[PDB]
C-alpha cells in the first residue's frame, strides 16, 4: 500500500510481489508431506498468529484487488464505458464502482488513489485491471 499509490515505481512493486510469491512457495514447499497435528504445520500457524496483523492486511489488499475484474467485466461498468476503447472517466469510473457497492467508501478513496490520474482524465481501466489482478491472483492462489 506504499508503492501502489504512486505510479512510478511499477517495476518495484512487481519485483516485491516476486519475492512474496517465492516466499510462499518456501512456505509449501515447507509444508509438503506434512501429517495431520505435524509440529512443521503447528511453527507455521504460531509464525502466522504472531504476524497476524500483516496476514489480514495483505489478505484485503488482495480481496480488494481480485474483485476487479468483475469490476471491469461487469455490464455496469460496460454501460459506463461507451464502447470497449479500453479508457473510461475517471468521474465514470468512480460512479460505476460504487454502483458497484461491494467496495467501501474507504476501499473506494484507496482505489482512486491508486489509479494513476492522466492528463487524458480517463484512467486506463484495462491496463488498471491487467497490471494489478494478475500479480493478486498468482499469490493469492498460493495463499490460498
Known sequence: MKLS???SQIELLKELMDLQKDMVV????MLEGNVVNGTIGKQMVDMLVESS????????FFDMFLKLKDLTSSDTFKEYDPDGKGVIS???????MESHK????????FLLS????????TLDYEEFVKRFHEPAKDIGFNVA
Open 102 to 109: 461491494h467496495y467501501t467508501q474507504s476501499e473506494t478513496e
Open 90 to 96: 475517471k468521474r465514470d469510473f468512480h460512479k460505476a
Open 114 to 121: 491508486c489509479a494513476e490520474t492522466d492528463e487524458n482524465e
Open 53 to 60: 496483523n500483516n496476514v489480514e492486511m495483505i489478505l484485503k
Open 26 to 29: 518456501m512456505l509449501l514447499s
Open 5 to 7: 499509490q504512486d505510479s
